[PDB]
Amino acid sequence: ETVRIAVVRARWHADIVDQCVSAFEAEMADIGGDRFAVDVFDVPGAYEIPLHARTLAETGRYGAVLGTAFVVNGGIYRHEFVASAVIDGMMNVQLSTGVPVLSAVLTPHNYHDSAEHHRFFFEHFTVKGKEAARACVEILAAREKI
Template sequence: MASELKNLSVFSTDHLPDISHRQFAIVVAEWNAEVTEALFSGAYQTLINYGAKVENIVRGNVPGSFELSLGAQWFAQRTEIDAVIALGCVIQGETKHNDYINHAVAQGLTNVGLQTGKPVIFGVLTPNNQQQALDRAGGVHGNKGDEAAMTAIKMLGLQQQVYSL
């Protein structure tokens, strides 16, 4: 479903795992900071609201979205980190740079998750313009940061289910 038809901050909270003992890394791109700071606030607050402890959330900044994959890998390689949330924003603009960056970041984050066996969440906005980004970073369409944090929580729940079989 297109995010214009969905509020990113509305999701099912049925059967969520206890995350009070889980450790999260949130990697935030500094490029488009107005947007990424709002994404971070949403992700952080969602983790807290659903049971994460402040001391179990660590933040790392990277210059831009392209660097999210390596930043996520460094955190995911740490044994104490249970899940990584990568937050960024690549606006379409007048060139095709976003096509290359978005594809590389999506593939990179996927690879980190597969290599480490940990949830590595793609919380990168790919809007056509600044207003669409703001609409998805706490605006009329909710906050992609909220959705990314909830995705991390739910993936930890699935991991717990699979490994307890």
């Protein structure tokens, strides 16, 4: 059977987020055999991830939902409220829909979009993207065992 996995990515810091989405989309598709299928959906910001995962999840056409974004402190406004709301949101959604939802919504201790700062998280996100895909495979598999 072909399991559909949806990726809901924010477009803020698209540059870095996409490094996670591509890495993720590779581990998922590359284990090719029509096993999994990755549909990617655009979302303005992290705050827009929960409701989108829910609507997607409620179609019953997906075995899992990945939420991904980079939620940082830009120096002017505080980012914790939104970060908190999104992480708690995806938890509420999956418990609600019974559809697993993995979190690739990251918040670093520091991010000044400096040349060095940008380089780093741009490369570490591919790492996290790979992590998420292998965790996705594992959770679905761990569910058959129930």
